[PDB]
Protein backbone atom coordinates (compact mmCIF):
# COMPACT_ATOMS: atom_id res chain seq x y z
CA UNK A 1 0.00 0.00 0.00
CA UNK A 2 1.29 3.57 -0.48
CA UNK A 3 2.29 5.59 2.57
CA UNK A 4 0.23 8.71 3.42
CA UNK A 5 0.43 11.16 0.52
CA UNK A 6 1.40 14.79 0.82
CA UNK A 7 0.08 17.76 -1.21
CA UNK A 8 2.47 20.67 -0.57
CA UNK A 9 1.93 24.27 -1.70
CA UNK A 10 5.14 26.30 -2.10
CA UNK A 11 4.06 29.93 -2.55
CA UNK A 12 7.69 30.98 -3.22
CA UNK A 13 8.06 34.79 -3.02
CA UNK A 14 4.45 35.73 -3.76
CA UNK A 15 1.32 37.00 -2.08
CA UNK A 16 -0.35 40.02 -0.54
CA UNK A 17 -2.39 40.01 2.68
CA UNK A 18 -5.58 40.42 0.62
CA UNK A 19 -4.83 37.60 -1.82
CA UNK A 20 -3.66 35.25 0.97
CA UNK A 21 -6.78 35.89 3.07
CA UNK A 22 -9.03 34.93 0.12
CA UNK A 23 -7.05 31.81 -0.84
CA UNK A 24 -6.86 30.54 2.74
CA UNK A 25 -10.69 30.84 3.01
CA UNK A 26 -10.94 28.73 -0.17
CA UNK A 27 -8.70 26.11 1.48
CA UNK A 28 -10.70 26.24 4.72
CA UNK A 29 -14.04 25.62 2.97
CA UNK A 30 -12.75 22.60 1.00
CA UNK A 31 -13.58 19.47 2.97
CA UNK A 32 -10.96 16.76 2.53
CA UNK A 33 -12.26 13.26 3.09
CA UNK A 34 -9.19 11.07 2.65
CA UNK A 35 -5.94 10.68 4.59
CA UNK A 36 -3.46 13.21 3.16
CA UNK A 37 -1.12 15.68 4.80
CA UNK A 38 -1.53 19.11 3.22
CA UNK A 39 1.35 21.59 3.58
CA UNK A 40 1.40 25.34 2.88
CA UNK A 41 4.70 27.22 2.68
CA UNK A 42 4.27 31.01 2.58
CA UNK A 43 7.01 33.65 2.75
CA UNK A 44 8.39 34.24 6.24
CA UNK A 45 6.48 37.51 6.73
CA UNK A 46 3.16 35.77 6.02
CA UNK A 47 3.60 32.86 8.44
CA UNK A 48 1.75 34.67 11.27
CA UNK A 49 -1.15 35.65 9.01
CA UNK A 50 -1.54 32.10 7.70
CA UNK A 51 -1.29 30.70 11.24
CA UNK A 52 -4.12 33.00 12.32
CA UNK A 53 -6.50 32.19 9.42
CA UNK A 54 -5.83 28.62 8.28
CA UNK A 55 -8.24 26.27 10.06
CA UNK A 56 -8.45 23.19 7.81
CA UNK A 57 -7.27 20.32 10.03
CA UNK A 58 -5.45 18.44 7.25
CA UNK A 59 -2.92 21.30 6.85
CA UNK A 60 0.41 22.17 8.49
CA UNK A 61 2.53 25.28 7.77
CA UNK A 62 6.11 25.03 6.50
CA UNK A 63 8.92 27.54 6.09
CA UNK A 64 10.46 27.80 2.59
CA UNK A 65 14.03 27.81 3.94
CA UNK A 66 16.00 28.22 7.21
CA UNK A 67 19.52 28.30 8.67
CA UNK A 68 20.46 25.92 11.50
CA UNK A 69 21.37 28.34 14.29
CA UNK A 70 20.44 31.78 15.60
CA UNK A 71 23.16 34.44 15.67
CA UNK A 72 24.82 37.20 13.63
CA UNK A 73 23.27 36.30 10.28
CA UNK A 74 21.56 39.46 9.06
CA UNK A 75 18.52 38.72 6.95
CA UNK A 76 18.16 34.97 7.68
CA UNK A 77 15.67 33.00 9.81
CA UNK A 78 16.87 30.08 11.95
CA UNK A 79 15.38 26.72 12.97
CA UNK A 80 15.06 27.57 16.68
CA UNK A 81 13.16 30.77 15.77
CA UNK A 82 10.73 28.82 13.56
CA UNK A 83 10.18 26.18 16.23
CA UNK A 84 9.49 28.91 18.80
CA UNK A 85 6.68 30.33 16.63
CA UNK A 86 5.08 26.92 15.99
CA UNK A 87 6.55 25.97 12.62
CA UNK A 88 8.07 22.48 12.46
CA UNK A 89 8.16 21.73 8.74
CA UNK A 90 10.72 23.21 6.34
CA UNK A 91 11.52 22.91 2.63
CA UNK A 92 15.30 22.65 2.01
CA UNK A 93 17.52 22.52 -1.07
CA UNK A 94 14.95 23.94 -3.49
CA UNK A 95 16.45 24.29 -6.97
CA UNK A 96 16.09 28.09 -6.81
CA UNK A 97 18.27 28.16 -3.67
CA UNK A 98 20.81 25.78 -5.18
CA UNK A 99 20.96 27.94 -8.34
CA UNK A 100 20.72 31.55 -7.19
CA UNK A 101 21.78 31.53 -3.56
CA UNK A 102 24.74 29.16 -3.51
CA UNK A 103 23.41 26.09 -1.71
CA UNK A 104 25.68 23.19 -2.63
CA UNK A 105 25.01 19.53 -1.81
CA UNK A 106 27.11 19.92 1.35
CA UNK A 107 25.20 22.99 2.53
CA UNK A 108 21.82 21.31 1.88
CA UNK A 109 22.92 18.09 3.63
CA UNK A 110 24.05 20.08 6.72
CA UNK A 111 20.77 22.01 6.83
CA UNK A 112 18.74 18.77 6.50
CA UNK A 113 20.78 17.07 9.23
CA UNK A 114 20.29 20.01 11.63
CA UNK A 115 16.58 20.24 10.86
CA UNK A 116 16.19 16.53 11.68
CA UNK A 117 18.11 17.01 14.95
CA UNK A 118 15.79 19.87 15.90
CA UNK A 119 12.67 17.77 15.28
CA UNK A 120 11.50 19.22 11.95
CA UNK A 121 9.74 17.34 9.16
CA UNK A 122 11.84 18.19 6.13
CA UNK A 123 10.95 18.31 2.44
CA UNK A 124 14.35 17.89 0.77
CA UNK A 125 14.47 18.76 -2.94
CA UNK A 126 16.60 17.05 -5.59
CA UNK A 127 16.59 17.00 -9.39
CA UNK A 128 18.62 17.24 -12.59
CA UNK A 129 18.93 19.99 -15.18
CA UNK A 130 18.04 19.65 -18.87
CA UNK A 131 21.75 19.41 -19.68
CA UNK A 132 22.28 16.50 -17.25
CA UNK A 133 19.16 14.74 -18.48
CA UNK A 134 20.29 14.95 -22.15
CA UNK A 135 23.74 13.65 -21.15
CA UNK A 136 22.06 10.61 -19.57
CA UNK A 137 23.23 11.62 -16.10
CA UNK A 138 19.80 11.82 -14.39
CA UNK A 139 20.39 8.76 -12.17
CA UNK A 140 23.91 9.74 -11.20
CA UNK A 141 22.83 13.29 -10.30
CA UNK A 142 19.74 12.45 -8.24
CA UNK A 143 21.58 9.65 -6.40
CA UNK A 144 24.57 11.93 -5.68
CA UNK A 145 22.29 14.63 -4.23
CA UNK A 146 20.47 12.03 -2.12
CA UNK A 147 23.53 10.21 -0.84
CA UNK A 148 25.08 13.55 0.16
CA UNK A 149 22.06 14.04 2.46
CA UNK A 150 22.05 10.41 3.58
CA UNK A 151 25.69 10.69 4.71
CA UNK A 152 24.75 13.15 7.50
CA UNK A 153 21.71 11.26 8.73
CA UNK A 154 21.06 8.39 11.11
CA UNK A 155 18.55 5.68 10.18
CA UNK A 156 15.96 6.99 12.63
CA UNK A 157 16.10 10.52 11.10
CA UNK A 158 14.58 9.17 7.82
CA UNK A 159 11.25 9.14 9.60
CA UNK A 160 11.28 12.98 9.35
CA UNK A 161 12.39 13.21 5.71
CA UNK A 162 10.24 13.61 2.63
CA UNK A 163 12.04 13.66 -0.77
CA UNK A 164 10.74 15.93 -3.56
CA UNK A 165 12.01 15.16 -7.04
CA UNK A 166 11.67 18.17 -9.31
CA UNK A 167 13.51 18.13 -12.64
CA UNK A 168 14.84 21.68 -13.06
CA UNK A 169 13.47 21.82 -16.63
CA UNK A 170 9.90 21.24 -15.35
CA UNK A 171 9.96 24.03 -12.75
CA UNK A 172 7.62 26.85 -13.77
CA UNK A 173 8.10 26.09 -17.49
CA UNK A 174 4.79 24.33 -18.17
CA UNK A 175 6.73 21.23 -19.33
CA UNK A 176 5.70 18.62 -16.77
CA UNK A 177 7.50 15.28 -16.71
CA UNK A 178 5.42 12.39 -18.03
CA UNK A 179 4.13 9.87 -15.49
CA UNK A 180 6.61 7.39 -16.98
CA UNK A 181 9.61 9.75 -16.66
CA UNK A 182 8.74 10.59 -13.05
CA UNK A 183 7.98 6.98 -12.08
CA UNK A 184 11.39 5.76 -13.33
CA UNK A 185 13.25 8.25 -11.15
CA UNK A 186 11.03 7.65 -8.11
CA UNK A 187 11.55 3.89 -8.43
CA UNK A 188 15.34 4.35 -8.70
CA UNK A 189 15.38 6.52 -5.56
CA UNK A 190 13.21 4.08 -3.58
CA UNK A 191 15.47 1.14 -4.51
CA UNK A 192 18.60 3.08 -3.51
CA UNK A 193 17.06 3.88 -0.12
CA UNK A 194 15.93 0.28 0.26
CA UNK A 195 19.47 -0.99 -0.37
CA UNK A 196 21.51 1.64 1.43
CA UNK A 197 19.23 2.65 4.33
CA UNK A 198 16.72 -0.17 4.88
CA UNK A 199 13.66 -1.83 3.30
CA UNK A 200 11.48 -0.66 6.20
CA UNK A 201 12.61 2.94 5.56
CA UNK A 202 11.97 2.63 1.82
CA UNK A 203 8.42 1.32 2.34
CA UNK A 204 7.39 4.37 4.38
CA UNK A 205 9.26 7.10 2.54
CA UNK A 206 7.19 9.70 0.75
CA UNK A 207 8.74 10.78 -2.55
CA UNK A 208 6.87 13.68 -4.17
CA UNK A 209 6.99 14.93 -7.73
CA UNK A 210 7.16 18.66 -8.48
CA UNK A 211 7.46 20.76 -11.63
CA UNK A 212 4.44 22.13 -13.52
CA UNK A 213 1.91 20.00 -11.63
CA UNK A 214 -1.67 21.23 -12.26
CA UNK A 215 -5.15 19.93 -11.45
CA UNK A 216 -5.46 18.13 -14.80
CA UNK A 217 -2.14 16.20 -14.82
CA UNK A 218 -2.04 15.40 -11.09
CA UNK A 219 -4.30 12.33 -11.16
CA UNK A 220 -2.24 10.62 -13.88
CA UNK A 221 1.00 11.17 -11.98
CA UNK A 222 -0.48 9.94 -8.71
CA UNK A 223 -1.57 6.68 -10.40
CA UNK A 224 2.12 5.57 -10.58
CA UNK A 225 3.19 3.26 -7.76
CA UNK A 226 6.18 5.22 -6.41
CA UNK A 227 4.69 8.74 -6.54
CA UNK A 228 3.42 9.82 -3.12
CA UNK A 229 2.13 13.31 -3.84
CA UNK A 230 3.32 16.69 -5.06
CA UNK A 231 5.24 19.90 -4.45
CA UNK A 232 3.29 22.59 -6.29
CA UNK A 233 4.37 26.09 -7.20
CA UNK A 234 2.21 28.15 -9.54
CA UNK A 235 -0.97 26.05 -9.24
CA UNK A 236 -0.86 26.34 -5.45
CA UNK A 237 -1.67 30.06 -5.67
CA UNK A 238 -5.06 29.24 -7.22
CA UNK A 239 -8.28 27.53 -6.15
CA UNK A 240 -7.42 24.47 -8.37
CA UNK A 241 -5.04 23.42 -5.55
CA UNK A 242 -8.23 21.82 -4.13
CA UNK A 243 -8.39 19.36 -7.03
CA UNK A 244 -4.64 18.65 -6.76
CA UNK A 245 -5.25 17.60 -3.15
CA UNK A 246 -8.21 15.45 -4.29
CA UNK A 247 -6.08 13.74 -6.94
CA UNK A 248 -4.20 11.95 -4.13
CA UNK A 249 -7.30 9.86 -3.29
CA UNK B 1 23.63 71.82 12.55
CA UNK B 2 23.47 68.01 12.31
CA UNK B 3 20.57 66.40 10.47
CA UNK B 4 18.12 64.27 12.49
CA UNK B 5 19.99 61.37 14.07
CA UNK B 6 19.00 57.73 13.79
CA UNK B 7 19.40 54.97 16.41
CA UNK B 8 18.86 51.66 14.59
CA UNK B 9 18.57 48.24 16.25
CA UNK B 10 19.52 45.30 14.00
CA UNK B 11 18.42 42.15 15.83
CA UNK B 12 20.06 39.94 13.15
CA UNK B 13 18.88 36.32 13.47
CA UNK B 14 17.88 36.37 17.14
CA UNK B 15 14.85 36.45 19.38
CA UNK B 16 11.96 34.43 20.73
CA UNK B 17 8.37 35.66 21.09
CA UNK B 18 8.85 35.84 24.89
CA UNK B 19 12.12 37.78 24.76
CA UNK B 20 10.82 40.16 22.06
CA UNK B 21 7.61 40.90 23.98
CA UNK B 22 9.64 41.92 27.07
CA UNK B 23 12.16 44.05 25.17
CA UNK B 24 9.47 45.87 23.17
CA UNK B 25 7.70 46.78 26.47
CA UNK B 26 11.02 48.23 27.69
CA UNK B 27 11.21 50.32 24.50
CA UNK B 28 7.58 51.41 24.85
CA UNK B 29 8.04 52.66 28.43
CA UNK B 30 11.16 54.72 27.59
CA UNK B 31 10.06 58.27 26.84
CA UNK B 32 12.24 59.94 24.23
CA UNK B 33 12.32 63.70 24.45
CA UNK B 34 14.52 64.74 21.54
CA UNK B 35 14.17 64.50 17.76
CA UNK B 36 15.59 61.12 16.71
CA UNK B 37 14.31 58.42 14.40
CA UNK B 38 14.50 55.03 16.11
CA UNK B 39 14.53 51.92 13.91
CA UNK B 40 14.03 48.27 14.89
CA UNK B 41 14.89 45.49 12.45
CA UNK B 42 13.67 42.06 13.59
CA UNK B 43 13.77 38.80 11.61
CA UNK B 44 11.05 38.49 8.98
CA UNK B 45 8.92 36.11 11.05
CA UNK B 46 8.81 38.59 13.94
CA UNK B 47 7.73 41.64 11.93
CA UNK B 48 4.01 41.05 12.64
CA UNK B 49 4.61 40.57 16.37
CA UNK B 50 6.68 43.76 16.61
CA UNK B 51 4.08 45.66 14.57
CA UNK B 52 1.38 44.57 17.01
CA UNK B 53 3.26 45.49 20.21
CA UNK B 54 5.59 48.40 19.45
CA UNK B 55 3.83 51.67 20.33
CA UNK B 56 6.64 54.18 20.92
CA UNK B 57 6.00 56.93 18.36
CA UNK B 58 9.69 57.61 17.63
CA UNK B 59 10.14 54.10 16.15
CA UNK B 60 9.69 52.60 12.66
CA UNK B 61 10.20 48.92 11.72
CA UNK B 62 12.73 47.84 9.10
CA UNK B 63 13.40 44.57 7.30
CA UNK B 64 16.97 43.19 7.55
CA UNK B 65 17.13 42.37 3.82
CA UNK B 66 14.88 42.02 0.73
CA UNK B 67 14.91 41.17 -2.98
CA UNK B 68 13.51 43.65 -5.52
CA UNK B 69 10.68 41.65 -7.09
CA UNK B 70 8.15 38.96 -6.20
CA UNK B 71 8.31 35.67 -8.10
CA UNK B 72 9.89 32.21 -8.12
CA UNK B 73 12.52 32.88 -5.46
CA UNK B 74 11.99 30.20 -2.81
CA UNK B 75 12.91 31.41 0.64
CA UNK B 76 13.27 35.16 -0.09
CA UNK B 77 11.05 38.15 0.78
CA UNK B 78 10.51 40.93 -1.78
CA UNK B 79 10.06 44.71 -1.56
CA UNK B 80 6.43 44.72 -2.77
CA UNK B 81 5.55 42.13 -0.09
CA UNK B 82 7.16 44.25 2.65
CA UNK B 83 5.40 47.40 1.44
CA UNK B 84 2.07 45.54 1.43
CA UNK B 85 2.48 44.65 5.12
CA UNK B 86 3.46 48.19 6.15
CA UNK B 87 7.26 48.00 6.18
CA UNK B 88 9.02 50.77 4.26
CA UNK B 89 12.54 50.73 5.68
CA UNK B 90 15.16 48.12 4.79
CA UNK B 91 18.80 47.46 5.67
CA UNK B 92 20.85 46.44 2.58
CA UNK B 93 24.42 45.31 1.97
CA UNK B 94 25.14 44.29 5.57
CA UNK B 95 28.66 42.85 5.86
CA UNK B 96 27.25 39.44 6.84
CA UNK B 97 25.29 39.32 3.55
CA UNK B 98 28.29 40.49 1.54
CA UNK B 99 30.46 37.82 3.21
CA UNK B 100 28.28 34.74 3.61
CA UNK B 101 25.51 35.14 1.07
CA UNK B 102 27.30 36.47 -2.00
CA UNK B 103 26.14 40.09 -2.21
CA UNK B 104 28.67 41.94 -4.35
CA UNK B 105 28.80 45.71 -4.83
CA UNK B 106 26.71 45.33 -7.99
CA UNK B 107 24.03 43.26 -6.26
CA UNK B 108 23.83 45.72 -3.33
CA UNK B 109 23.68 48.73 -5.68
CA UNK B 110 20.80 47.12 -7.66
CA UNK B 111 18.88 46.32 -4.47
CA UNK B 112 19.38 49.90 -3.16
CA UNK B 113 18.27 51.39 -6.48
CA UNK B 114 15.10 49.25 -6.55
CA UNK B 115 14.31 50.01 -2.92
CA UNK B 116 14.56 53.74 -3.65
CA UNK B 117 12.26 53.35 -6.69
CA UNK B 118 9.70 51.55 -4.53
CA UNK B 119 9.70 54.33 -1.93
CA UNK B 120 11.74 52.69 0.85
CA UNK B 121 14.08 54.44 3.27
CA UNK B 122 17.28 52.44 2.93
CA UNK B 123 20.13 51.89 5.37
CA UNK B 124 23.01 50.94 3.06
CA UNK B 125 26.04 49.38 4.76
CA UNK B 126 29.68 49.84 3.74
CA UNK B 127 33.02 49.16 5.42
CA UNK B 128 36.52 47.72 5.11
CA UNK B 129 38.07 44.56 6.51
CA UNK B 130 41.07 44.44 8.86
CA UNK B 131 43.26 43.40 5.92
CA UNK B 132 42.20 46.42 3.82
CA UNK B 133 42.63 48.77 6.77
CA UNK B 134 46.20 47.53 7.44
CA UNK B 135 47.03 47.90 3.73
CA UNK B 136 45.93 51.55 3.92
CA UNK B 137 43.01 50.91 1.55
CA UNK B 138 40.17 52.08 3.84
CA UNK B 139 39.36 55.19 1.75
CA UNK B 140 39.55 53.40 -1.57
CA UNK B 141 37.29 50.58 -0.35
CA UNK B 142 34.57 52.69 1.29
CA UNK B 143 34.49 55.10 -1.68
CA UNK B 144 34.31 52.21 -4.18
CA UNK B 145 31.36 50.65 -2.31
CA UNK B 146 29.61 54.03 -2.14
CA UNK B 147 30.18 55.06 -5.74
CA UNK B 148 28.89 51.66 -6.90
CA UNK B 149 25.59 52.54 -5.18
CA UNK B 150 25.70 56.16 -6.36
CA UNK B 151 26.00 55.02 -10.00
CA UNK B 152 22.46 53.54 -9.94
CA UNK B 153 20.80 56.45 -8.18
CA UNK B 154 19.33 59.78 -9.21
CA UNK B 155 20.02 62.89 -7.13
CA UNK B 156 16.49 62.91 -5.69
CA UNK B 157 16.83 59.27 -4.46
CA UNK B 158 19.54 60.37 -1.94
CA UNK B 159 16.73 61.74 0.19
CA UNK B 160 15.81 58.09 1.01
CA UNK B 161 19.34 56.85 1.69
CA UNK B 162 21.11 56.53 5.01
CA UNK B 163 24.75 55.29 4.95
CA UNK B 164 26.03 53.03 7.76
CA UNK B 165 29.79 52.70 8.04
CA UNK B 166 30.74 49.56 9.92
CA UNK B 167 34.36 48.41 9.78
CA UNK B 168 34.17 44.61 9.48
CA UNK B 169 36.73 44.22 12.28
CA UNK B 170 34.44 46.06 14.74
CA UNK B 171 31.35 43.94 14.06
CA UNK B 172 30.52 41.81 17.10
CA UNK B 173 34.18 41.67 18.19
CA UNK B 174 34.06 44.18 21.04
CA UNK B 175 36.74 46.27 19.27
CA UNK B 176 34.89 49.50 18.54
CA UNK B 177 36.52 52.10 16.30
CA UNK B 178 37.76 55.18 18.15
CA UNK B 179 35.80 58.41 17.68
CA UNK B 180 38.78 59.69 15.69
CA UNK B 181 38.93 56.64 13.37
CA UNK B 182 35.18 56.81 12.70
CA UNK B 183 35.14 60.60 12.24
CA UNK B 184 37.88 60.48 9.58
CA UNK B 185 35.93 58.00 7.46
CA UNK B 186 32.61 59.81 7.94
CA UNK B 187 34.22 63.11 6.91
CA UNK B 188 35.74 61.49 3.80
CA UNK B 189 32.35 60.05 2.79
CA UNK B 190 30.53 63.36 3.34
CA UNK B 191 33.08 65.25 1.22
CA UNK B 192 32.81 62.69 -1.60
CA UNK B 193 29.01 63.05 -1.60
CA UNK B 194 29.34 66.83 -1.47
CA UNK B 195 31.61 66.84 -4.53
CA UNK B 196 30.01 64.10 -6.61
CA UNK B 197 26.31 64.40 -5.70
CA UNK B 198 25.73 67.90 -4.29
CA UNK B 199 26.45 70.06 -1.23
CA UNK B 200 22.74 70.18 -0.37
CA UNK B 201 22.64 66.35 -0.39
CA UNK B 202 25.77 66.11 1.76
CA UNK B 203 24.36 68.51 4.39
CA UNK B 204 21.28 66.36 4.97
CA UNK B 205 22.78 62.90 4.67
CA UNK B 206 22.78 60.74 7.77
CA UNK B 207 25.93 58.63 8.08
CA UNK B 208 25.78 56.18 10.99
CA UNK B 209 28.57 54.30 12.70
CA UNK B 210 28.16 50.61 13.59
CA UNK B 211 30.41 47.96 15.13
CA UNK B 212 30.51 47.23 18.87
CA UNK B 213 28.54 50.34 19.85
CA UNK B 214 27.37 50.14 23.50
CA UNK B 215 25.74 52.56 25.94
CA UNK B 216 29.10 53.69 27.35
CA UNK B 217 30.94 54.50 24.08
CA UNK B 218 27.95 55.93 22.19
CA UNK B 219 28.08 59.46 23.62
CA UNK B 220 31.76 59.92 22.69
CA UNK B 221 31.15 58.79 19.11
CA UNK B 222 28.10 61.01 18.73
CA UNK B 223 30.15 64.06 19.81
CA UNK B 224 32.03 63.95 16.44
CA UNK B 225 30.65 66.33 13.82
CA UNK B 226 30.02 63.86 10.97
CA UNK B 227 28.51 61.00 13.01
CA UNK B 228 24.71 61.02 12.81
CA UNK B 229 23.80 58.01 14.92
CA UNK B 230 24.31 54.27 15.07
CA UNK B 231 23.53 50.81 13.72
CA UNK B 232 23.60 48.52 16.77
CA UNK B 233 23.76 44.76 16.90
CA UNK B 234 24.37 43.03 20.21
CA UNK B 235 23.54 46.00 22.46
CA UNK B 236 20.17 46.43 20.75
CA UNK B 237 18.95 43.15 22.26
CA UNK B 238 19.27 44.64 25.76
CA UNK B 239 17.63 47.41 27.79
CA UNK B 240 20.82 49.58 27.43
CA UNK B 241 19.56 50.39 23.90
CA UNK B 242 17.59 53.11 25.76
CA UNK B 243 20.82 54.91 26.71
CA UNK B 244 22.21 54.50 23.17
CA UNK B 245 19.13 56.35 21.91
CA UNK B 246 19.65 59.03 24.60
CA UNK B 247 23.30 59.48 23.57
CA UNK B 248 22.08 61.13 20.34
CA UNK B 249 20.80 64.17 22.29
O1 LIG C 1 8.43 24.33 -5.17
C2 LIG C 1 7.78 23.76 -6.01
N3 LIG C 1 8.08 23.89 -7.28
O4 LIG C 1 9.18 24.72 -7.53
C5 LIG C 1 7.20 23.61 -8.43
C6 LIG C 1 7.12 24.96 -9.18
P7 LIG C 1 5.80 24.93 -10.41
O8 LIG C 1 4.66 24.09 -9.84
O9 LIG C 1 5.31 26.37 -10.68
O10 LIG C 1 6.40 24.36 -11.71
O1 LIG D 1 24.04 45.56 12.10
C2 LIG D 1 24.71 46.13 12.93
N3 LIG D 1 25.89 45.68 13.26
O4 LIG D 1 26.27 44.53 12.57
C5 LIG D 1 26.65 45.98 14.48
C6 LIG D 1 26.87 44.61 15.15
P7 LIG D 1 27.46 44.79 16.84
O8 LIG D 1 26.78 46.03 17.43
O9 LIG D 1 27.08 43.55 17.66
O10 LIG D 1 28.99 44.90 16.78
- The three-state (H, E, C) secondary structure of B162-226, written as one string: EEEECCHHHCCCCCCCCHHHHHHHHHHHHHHHHHHCCHHHHHHCCEEEECCCCCCCHHHHHCCCC
Strand pairing class (B59-61; B89-92): unpaired
Closest CA to B247 of B212, B231, B211, B223: B223
The residue count of chain A comes to 249
Closest CA to A139 of A178, A87, A191: A191
Q: For this structure, is B166 an active site residue?
A: yes
User: What is the best residue among A7, A11, A12, A126 to mutate for testing ligand 1's pocket, by most ligand atoms within 8 Å of CB?
Assistant: A12
Which ligand has the nearest atom to the CA of A11?
Answer: 1
A12 has binding-site annotation: yes
User: Can you state the angle between helices B138-150 and B179-196, rounded to 10 degrees?
Assistant: 40
Closest CA to A126 of A104, A174, A171, A93: A93
Query: What's the CA gap between A75 and B182, in Å, rounded?
Result: 25
Q: Is A68 left (phi over 0), alpha (psi -120 to 50) or beta?
A: alpha
Burial A69-78 (b: 16+ CB within 10 A, else e): ebebbbbbbb
B97 interface with A at CB cutoff 8 Å: yes
| Exp. method | X-ray
CA distance A114 to chain B (A): 16
A12 interface with B at CB cutoff 8 Å: yes
Query: What's the CA gap between B143 and B147, in Å, rounded?
Result: 6
- Ligand 2 centre distance from Cα of residue B211 (Å): 5
- Ligand 2 centre distance from Cα of residue B234 (Å): 6
Report the chain B residue with the minimal C-alpha distance to residue A18: B84
For domain A1-249, the question of CATH label 3.20.20.70 is answered with yes
Which ligand has the nearest atom to the CA of B12?
Answer: 2
CB contact under 8 A, B48 and A49: yes
Domain-wise residue ranges, chain A: 1-249
Catalytic residue among B96, B103, B128, B166: B166
User: Can you state the angle between helices B105-117 and B138-150, rounded to 10 degrees?
Assistant: 40
Q: Which residues contact A120 (CB under 8 A, 6 or more apart)?
A: A79, A82, A83, A88, A89, A90, A160
Amino acid sequence: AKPQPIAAANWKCNGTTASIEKLVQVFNEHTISHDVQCVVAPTFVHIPLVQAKLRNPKYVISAQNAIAKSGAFTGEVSMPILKDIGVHWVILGHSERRTYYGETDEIVAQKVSEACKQGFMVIACIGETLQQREANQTAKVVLSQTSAIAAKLTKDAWNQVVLAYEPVWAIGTGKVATPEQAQEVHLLLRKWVSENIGTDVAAKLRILYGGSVNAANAATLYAKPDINGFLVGGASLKPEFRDIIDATR
